[PDB]
Amino acid sequence: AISSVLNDILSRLDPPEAEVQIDRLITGRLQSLQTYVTQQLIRAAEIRA
Amino acid sequence: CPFGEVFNATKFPSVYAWERKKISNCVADYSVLYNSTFFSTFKCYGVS
Amino acid sequence: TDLIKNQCVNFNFNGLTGTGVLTPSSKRFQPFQQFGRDVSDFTDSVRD
Ligand SMILES: *[C@@H]1O[C@H](CO)[C@@H](O[C@@H]2O[C@H](CO)[C@@H](O[C@@H]3O[C@H](CO)[C@@H](O)[C@H](O)[C@@H]3O)[C@H](O)[C@H]2NC(C)=O)[C@H](O)[C@H]1NC(C)=O
Ligand SMILES: *[C@@H]1O[C@H](CO)[C@@H](O)[C@H](O)[C@H]1NC(C)=O
Numbered sequence: 001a002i003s004s005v006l007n008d009i010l011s012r013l014d015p016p017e018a019e020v021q022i023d024r025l026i027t028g029r030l031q032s033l034q035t036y037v038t039q040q041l042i043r044a045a046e047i048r049a
Numbered sequence: 050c051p052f053g054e055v056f057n058a059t060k061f062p063s064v065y066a067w068e069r070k071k072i073s074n075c076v077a078d079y080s081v082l083y084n085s086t087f088f089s090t091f092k093c094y095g096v097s
Numbered sequence: 098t099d100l101i102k103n104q105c106v107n108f109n110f111n112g113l114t115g116t117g118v119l120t121p122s123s124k125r126f127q128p129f130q131q132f133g134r135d136v137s138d139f140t141d142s143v144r145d
Contacts, residue, residue: 002095004138011114014097 001025050075056082100145110143 001024002009009021050072062068083091100119107116113132124133124142135141 007115012096 001028050077052077052082056087110145113140113143115140 001021002013004025006022006025009025010018013021052072055070055072082088102119102121105116105118108114108119122142126133126144130144132143133141
């Protein structure tokens with residue numbers, strides 16, 4: 001993306017095109033959340049043991 | 050800012066010897082050359 | 098406009114926008130610094 005900062009895309013970039021930049025950034029970030037939670041479940045299982 | 054001296058300049062340089070000037074210290078209205086066509090080519094990037 | 102402090106506001110500084118709560122600070126900036134950031138790359142404080 002142009003910038004990791006959402007505001008630096010949405011603020012200055014033309015609203016049409018901006019959706020492309022934003023959508024890309026969203027996908028990127030969602031992937032880290034999915035990764036994070038997956039690992040936490042695994043760690044939790046170890047704690048249960 | 051004296052954009053008049055940029056777009057309404059009497060003389061322009063050749064491309065092999067393109068020239069540059071610094072523009073500063075003002076309040077600039079950018080709609081003047083945008084919402085009123087004065088160009089055959091108008092392409093901006095990064096910022097609308 | 099004037100400043101609105103100690104409450105959630107919409108802000109627009111000289112190239113920096115967003116929302117939040119504006120408070121005075123004791124951060125020591127250098128003579129050549131406009132704003133600073135947190136450990137994570139997000140705006141922490143701004144020079145008026
Ligand atoms: C460079 O100078 C030219 C003129 O020498 C400027 O273009 C002219 O700008 C006027 C202002 O909008 C345009 O509209 C005119 O308004 C008057 C108002 O009464 C009207 O009587 C005229 O018939 C006309 O509507 C005019 O069409 C326009 N001319 C051209 C060829 O574009 C130009 O904007 C200046 N550029 C800069 C950067 O200053
Ligand atoms: C186009 O720019 C001029 C600059 O003075 C402004 O007055 C005019 O209202 C603008 N047109 C539109 C549709 O915003």
